[PDB]
Design a binder for these strands. Sequence first.
DNA 1: TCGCGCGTCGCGCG
DNA 2: CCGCGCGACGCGCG
Lengths: 63, 64, 62, 62
Amino acid sequence: GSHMEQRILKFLEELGEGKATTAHDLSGKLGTPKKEINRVLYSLAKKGKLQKEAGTPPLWKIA
Amino acid sequence: GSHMEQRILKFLEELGEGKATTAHDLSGKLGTPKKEINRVLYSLAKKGKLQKEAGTPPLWKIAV
Amino acid sequence: SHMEQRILKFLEELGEGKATTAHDLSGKLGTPKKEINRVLYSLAKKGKLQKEAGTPPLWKIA
Amino acid sequence: SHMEQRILKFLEELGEGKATTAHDLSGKLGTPKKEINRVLYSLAKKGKLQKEAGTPPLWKIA
DNA sequence: TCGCGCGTCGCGCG
DNA sequence: CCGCGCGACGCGCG
């Protein structure tokens, strides 16, 4: 893309370091299906750019 | 309960003025079954403290 | 399950053109109406029961 | 359902007590794996099929 | 230990 | 024309 990766990093940056959010939350606000959201979230995780907090659902933040 | 009633009111107050949220949303940020959250949400509406807006799911905000 | 069996029986002991409500079944088998309704709608899927429109909805055997 | 029938047949031809996987069915029926599992688990709710523990899980006609 | 089926739900109801 | 069955869901999978 060009790029769902950058859009997410912003929503979290604007949210402020140390604050988390769910994929379901990012889905409805970025107008993007939760499916594509998670595959990018986990992609960012494999790049150490994001940190996941286990749970149901999982929480994502910049840290 | 009043404890839960006060927690919900706080959240909406901090959420700014004119903004709304959902029961599913409050459920996660309060660690409480949505079934229970709705009991309190609708009760506060009975007391004229909250207003319910149409939507999917419905949106809730402080009564004006 | 023990519920599906205990509902089918009751409705069978009922007439052919007879139909009852989930509320009547709840206050007859000492069972949460949520459970009764769960089973009823479950049996309606398997064609084992028939639902008649209205409030409350009426239920009978097929 | 037709998809339900194509699966039941395969398992019947496979023998009694025999089991296979979703991946296998997917390839021999030319149907996406997601669709296969939906029907498998669906039939499991109807008591038609039986799921055996494993990875991937094995499926047998109950 | 790639297991994955996964949809919708609005429900407040005593 | 209170009808209401409604649980859990974590899923990213190529």
